């Protein structure tokens, strides 16, 4: 919303010279992850460069893979398709895989209430903050966390075996901008 705030952070990180997710001494994604854990009281965070990443991380996070099924009920038409691509089917008998909250500039200020909800997987789409596509998966289920990072090429490579993998690594630059927003909107 403020051009100076966004410019200042992009300036700051660029001046650091540290703009790669896989680079050592890269605190922007960690800093983001902390705030979101605090706000949600969750123990594990996994950042993504796409909502699609967070969706897969949640599905494969609970061994809902090709051939399996879950409750495609509260899904939009897009995530309907993602699941059809992944090979997953529908059943009303089973629970929902995640509770997705689209975060934007209106509802960001009161994020604590949104996430103070007991559920397996909280998914946060940050795309509409306008810093680029970004999502974060939150859980206490360590096995989801580990499985979620491991679907990303370079996530914990720096005996839970990975199969198919994607580059859903988020840009520090982008992660830094969302981290600022959260701070400027009062999530210490």
């Amino acid at each position: 919303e403020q051009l100076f705030q966004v410019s200042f952070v992009l300036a700051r990180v660029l001046t650091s010279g540290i703009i790669m997710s896989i680079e050592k001494n890269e605190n922007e994604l960690k800093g983001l992850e902390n705030i979101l854990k605090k706000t949600s009281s969750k123990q594990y965070a996994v950042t993504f460069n796409s909502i699609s990443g967070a969706v897969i991380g949640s599905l494969w996070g609970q061994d809902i893979v090709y051939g399996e099924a879950t409750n495609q009920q509260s899904l939009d038409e897009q995530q309907e398709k993602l699941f059809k691509w992944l090979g997953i089917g529908h059943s009303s008998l089973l629970p929902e895989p995640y509770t997705l909250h689209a975060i934007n500039w209106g509802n960001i200020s009161n994020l604590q209430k949104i996430t103070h909800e007991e559920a397996h997987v909280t998914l946060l789409d940050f795309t509409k903050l306008g810093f680029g596509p970004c999502a974060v998966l939150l859980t206490n289920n360590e096995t989801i966390y580990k499985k979620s990072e491991r679907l990303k090429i370079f996530g914990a490579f720096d005996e839970i075996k990975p199969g198919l993998q994607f580059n859903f690594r988020l840009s520090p630059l982008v992660g830094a901008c969302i981290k600022m927003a959260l701070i400027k909107m009062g999530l210490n």
Binding site: T15, M20, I22, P133, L164, Q165
Partner: protein, 427 residues
């Protein structure tokens, strides 16, 4: 203010240091510890100012702008900007006509993302050996690896050297196969004066910050020759529901960077060329072979160890390599190895789990891969040293000469290299 600015300039090295003791034996290193760090990417004021320009524009317009600018420069008919190199290869494969169950011939030696792109396309990687010198997919191999399921061939311009498109192309027209390039290291690399990324039916390319043409974090771009391919790739995005979109922040960095790319590339070329020429005078080291039509981008500079010297009579090549790594590292030349394991032996292609239940893989006959199937690729891993960031960065004359001195210094110590190597523990 946290800054990466290097505060100590690299002094001009004394050429007498060729005669110096090795740093591993208490000698003074060619490159002092202060002068060991390089800067990458080259973040200049322009890039900061470009962020203040782009932030005021619709995010999708910035992405479009970048896509168009880079596309035009490359000379590709069509382009889709992605969130990653890996996604761009996925789209490059689908758009070109690869469908679930098809086999794609890839080299065994490349980044995991190459092969993961194929598996995301619901296709089956068929791994192949490389040429001992180019290190790219060996065309002589290809006959043996063709089946009825073979749909595409996916060469990698690995290190930034263009693969043998002349040959691989003719093979593809002949066997009715598509050609999809991985150009993720070959920013600005050309063949017959034409840029890598334009030869294939489609191609994908990392634009990550660790690449010679770096965008502001994670980024990639897919190129297509015909509109049919571009349309199929865009259709696939609609059907699949994947969000593979680029960040404006990432693209904004690309826009500014692109204006200065030719300058940084010129330094890279002249630097790398001087080193090739200098290493050719040494008995121990050889820079990368480059076909006459090709221009190397030199994202990585792989050096061959002449392991056949008499001083190394009964010494395994791997010990010669490990000895030279230690020796060079103490001098201040960080010569890591890019890929230690070939992609058929990475866990994903050992468990063959795919999307779950081994989805892609069970469509076709399982081929149990063995080390004896890739003799040239293993030969390379046993007998080469890779310079990455040291020559990707457009380093100053003082640093380049520092490299030259280091290799010349070690080249005078073939006898000690032999001794140190021989005393290394067995694996």
């Amino acid at each position: 203010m946290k800054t990466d600015f290097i505060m100590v300039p690299t002094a001009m090295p004394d050429e007498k240091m060729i005669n110096y003791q090795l740093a591993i034996d208490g000698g003074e290193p060619v490159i002092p510890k202060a002068n060991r760090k390089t800067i990458f990417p080259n973040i200049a004021k322009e890039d900061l100012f470009q962020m203040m320009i782009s932030v005021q524009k619709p995010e999708e317009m910035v992405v479009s702008e970048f896509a168009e600018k880079y596309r035009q420069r490359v000379g590709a008919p069509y382009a889709i900007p992605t969130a990653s190199g890996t996604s761009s290869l996925h789209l490059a494969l689908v758009g070109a006509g690869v469908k679930a169950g098809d086999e794609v011939i890839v080299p065994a030696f490349t980044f995991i993302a190459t092969a993961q792109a194929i598996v995301a396309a619901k296709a089956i990687p068929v791994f192949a050996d490389i040429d001992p010198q180019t290190y790219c997919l060996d065309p002589r191999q290809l006959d043996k690896k063709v089946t009825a399921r073979t749909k595409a061939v996916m060469p990698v311009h690995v290190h930034g050297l263009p693969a043998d498109i002349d040959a691989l192309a003719s093979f593809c027209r002949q066997h009715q196969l598509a050609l999809i390039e991985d150009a993720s290291h070959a920013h600005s690399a050309t063949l017959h004066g034409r840029y890598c990324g334009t030869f294939g039916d489609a191609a994908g390319q990392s634009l990550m910050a660790d690449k010679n043409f770096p965008l502001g974090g994670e980024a990639g771009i897919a190129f297509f020759k015909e509109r049919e391919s571009y349309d199929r790739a865009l259709a696939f995005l609609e059907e699949s529901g994947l969000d593979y979109r680029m960040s404006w922040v990432a693209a904004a960095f690309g826009i500014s960077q692109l204006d200065r790319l030719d300058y940084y590339d010129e330094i890279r070329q002249r630097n790398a060329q001087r080193l090739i020429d200098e290493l050719a005078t040494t008995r121990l080291f050889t820079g990368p072979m480059i076909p006459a039509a090709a221009k190397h981008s030199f994202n990585m500079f792989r050096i061959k160890i002449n392991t056949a010297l008499p001083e190394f009579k009964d010494i395994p090549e791997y010990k010669l390599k490990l000895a030279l790594q230690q020796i060079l590292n103490e001098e201040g030349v960080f010569a890591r190895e890019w890929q230690n394991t070939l992609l058929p032996f990475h866990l994903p292609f050992q468990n063959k789990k795919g999307f779950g239940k081994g989805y892609p893989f069970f469509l076709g006959d399982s081929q149990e891969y063995k080390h004896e199937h890739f003799p040239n690729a293993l030969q390379m891993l046993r007998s080469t040293l890779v310079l990455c960031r040291e020559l990707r960065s457009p380093v100053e004359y003082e640093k380049l000469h520092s490299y030259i001195i280091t290799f010349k210094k070690v080249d005078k110590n073939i006898q000690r290299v032999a001794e140190i190597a021989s005393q290394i523990d067995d694996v």
